[PDB]
Amino acid sequence: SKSDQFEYAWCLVRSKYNDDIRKGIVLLEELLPKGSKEEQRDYVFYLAVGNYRLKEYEKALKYVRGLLQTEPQNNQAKELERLIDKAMKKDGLLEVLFQ
Amino acid sequence: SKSDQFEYAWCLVRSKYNDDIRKGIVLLEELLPKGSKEEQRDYVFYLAVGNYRLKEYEKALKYVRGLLQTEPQNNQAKELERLIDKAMKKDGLLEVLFQ
């Protein structure tokens, strides 16, 4: 069933282990076409969370951004974009810490 | 399907969140009668891991023990009983640390 693959992928994207988090993601990507209007809004937000936890900060942003133009005022999406920028600003400091 | 409820409960019992771990457990308890000989050996071992992660050290032992009389030489079960005793010895030190 469709409501059940989500749960599995939700529990997966929550795991402490990166491998479970890739699997949680790929299941969401397959689940994305099969989605309803607001089912997709939810999958997209959870792909961003997963990608963000894998330091795939680029890809994460591309999701949370695409959701944000659909839903400009989702302050849960706003806050998830606010945490992705900070990760990224701190990362690019540590990147050039040796010039 | 039966092979699939396991995965869900396996990913659940692996989670960082206690609530996911209770749900992972209860699914295993329902799954226990439906089991094969060695499917049950596996469920029991994973109920012990889950209970152990919830500091339910009593209940954990009762599983890893019941498996151990079936499988005296499962050194993965032996090692899981070895980690449950240490937890428990350290716990009962901190218990009476004030007399």
Numbering used by the authors:
A (entry chain A), B (entry chain A): 31 to 129
From the paper:
A tetratricopeptide repeat (TPR) motif containing mitochondrial outer membrane protein, mitochondrial fission protein 1 (Fis1), mediates mitochondrial fission by recruiting large cytosolic GTPase, Drp1, to the mitochondrial outer membrane. The cytosolic domain of Fis1 is composed of 6 tight α-helices with two anti-parallel TPR motifs forming a concave hydrophobic surface. Fis1 interaction with Drp1 occurs during cellular stress, but not under physiological conditions, suggesting that cellular signals during stress activate Fis1. Human Fis1 protein contains a single cysteine, Cys41, in the entire protein.
To explore this possibility further, we crystallized and determined the X-ray structures of the WT and three phosphorylation mimic-mutants of Fis1: Thr34Asp Fis1, Thr34Glu Fis1 and Tyr38Glu Fis1. Each of these mutants was previously shown to be sufficient to increase Drp1 recruitment to mitochondria and subsequent mitochondrial fission in cell-based studies. Consistently, we observed that the first 30 residues including the α1 helix were missing from the structure providing strong evidence that the α1 helix undergoes significant conformational change and is potentially disordered in the phosphorylated forms, whereas it was intact in the WT. We crystallized the phosphorylation-mimic mutants, Thr34Asp, Thr34Glu and Tyr38Glu Fis1, and we observed that in all the cases, these mutants crystallized as covalent dimers mediated by Cys41 disulfide bridge between two Fis1 protomers. As Thr34Asp, Thr34Glu and Tyr38Glu Fis1 have a greater propensity for a conformationally altered N-terminus and hence have more exposed Cys41, they crystallized as covalent dimers. Upon closer examination of the crystal structures, we observed that the concave hydrophobic surface in the covalent dimers of all the phosphorylation-mimic mutants was exposed. Our crystal structure not only shows the absence of α1 helix but also shows that there is no space for structured α1 helix in the covalent dimer as this space is occupied by α2 helix of another monomer. Here we showed that Cys41 is also oxidizable and mediates Fis1 covalent dimerization through disulfide linkage. This oxidation-induced Fis1 dimerization was obvious in the crystal structures of Thr34Asp, Thr34Glu and Tyr38Glu Fis1, where we saw a clear electron density for the disulfide linkage. When we modeled the structure of Fis1 WT dimer using the Thr34Asp Fis1 covalent dimer with modeled the missing unstructured first 30 residues, the Fis1 covalent WT dimer perfectly fitted the SAXS curve for WT Fis1 dimer.
